[PDB]
């Protein structure tokens, strides 16, 4: 997260860290047994870490639970990151509390200009590299599709939207991958891609979760 602020401990209780010896991606709790992340975050041997603030210090509200299965979207395309969504099942149900809470799936999409919350343990610099140990937050609006497509011609699908600031300086970044974009109390986006971080006229691109709600609901009821 570049240009954001410290969220504050467990102020984003649906935010998870995916860990395989180390944090490698964000995720969102959507019920006690299931997480939503990005397809480009797929790998075996995943441990889900909930209740986290400082990811390098055990502060007392953590729950560490291994993944029993992962389901990348059937239509994911690694070349273009179209349908960049994945579901991860917990081997045991998370114990939900104020610190470890699920985020609601959207009933409908969000419109351009809607303010959202983007969060993660990703890089905080526009040039160079600095990883925070505490959770960073960023308020950012959903941008119009035309400004999104103008920035990334021939690369944006109906399954993607841009959010952020065309002037730059505020954006998500590497290590934020898979993380939530929350608008009006719903999970509308997943941190997917972009050119650099916080670069002018290069806004962040997010997986459009509202297109996947039936697939999400169908998949977890059958797995
Ligand atoms: N500036 C941002 N908002 C932002 C946030 C998070 C990321 C992390 N994502 C990534 O690094 C993903 C993973 C595979 C290649 N990749 C890219 O961003 C490269 C460009 C992609 C590859 C294919 C279509 C465009 C990248 C950018
Ligand atoms: Ca911790």
Curated annotation (Swiss-Prot):
Its cofactor is Ca(2+). Ca(2+) binds at residues 52, 54, 57, 62. Gene3D superfamilies: Trypsin-like serine proteases (2.40.10.10). Subsequent cleavage after Lys-125 leads to alpha-trypsin. Further cleavage after Lys-170 yields pseudotrypsin. A cleavage may also occur after Arg-99. Binds 1 Ca(2+) ion per subunit. Disulfide bonds join 7-137, 25-41, 109-210, 116-183, 148-162, 173-197. Its EC number is 3.4.21.4. Substrate binds at residues 171-172, 174-175, 177. CDD domains: Tryp_SPc. Synthesized in the acinar cells of the pancreas. Pfam families: Trypsin. Is inhibited by scorpion cyclotide trypsin inhibitor TopI1. Its main location: secreted. SUPFAM superfamilies: Trypsin-like serine proteases. Coiled coil: none annotated. GO terms for biological process: digestion; proteolysis. It comes from the Eukaryota. Residues 1-221 form the Peptidase S1 domain. Keywords: Calcium, Digestion, Disulfide bond, Hydrolase, Metal-binding, Protease, Secreted, Serine protease, Signal, Zymogen. GO terms for molecular function: endopeptidase activity; metal ion binding; serine-type endopeptidase activity; serpin family protein binding. InterPro entries: Peptidase_S1_PA, Peptidase_S1_PA_chymotrypsin, Peptidase_S1A, Serine_Proteases_S1, Trypsin_dom, TRYPSIN_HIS, TRYPSIN_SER. The keyword Nucleus does not apply. Belongs to the peptidase S1 family. Interacts with SERPINA1. This is Serine protease 1. It comes from Bos taurus.
């Amino acid at each position: 997260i570049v240009g954001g602020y410290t969220c504050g401990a467990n102020t984003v209780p649906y935010q998870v860290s995916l860990n395989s010896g180390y944090h490698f991606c964000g995720g969102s709790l959507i019920n006690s047994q299931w997480v939503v992340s990005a397809a480009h975050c797929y790998k075996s041997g995943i441990q889900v870490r909930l209740g986290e603030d400082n990811i390098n210090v055990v502060e007392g509200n953590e729950q560490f639970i291994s993944a029993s299965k992962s389901i990348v979207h059937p239509s994911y395309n690694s070349n273009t990151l179209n349908n960049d969504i994945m579901l991860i099942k917990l081997k045991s149900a998370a114990s939900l509390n104020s610190r470890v809470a699920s985020i609601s799936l959207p009933t409908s999409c969000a419109s351009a200009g809607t303010q959202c919350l983007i969060s993660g343990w990703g890089n905080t610099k526009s040039s160079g590299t600095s990883y925070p140990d505490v959770l960073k937050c960023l308020k950012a609006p959903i941008l119009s599709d035309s400004s999104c497509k103008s920035a990334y011609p021939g690369q944006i699908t109906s399954n993607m939207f841009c959010a952020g600031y065309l002037e730059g300086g505020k954006d998500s970044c590497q290590g934020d991958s898979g993380g939530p974009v929350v608008c009006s109390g719903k999970l509308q986006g997943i941190v997917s891609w972009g050119s650099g971080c916080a670069q002018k006229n290069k806004p962040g691109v997010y997986t459009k979760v509202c297109n996947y709600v039936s697939w999400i609901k169908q998949t977890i009821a059958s797995n």
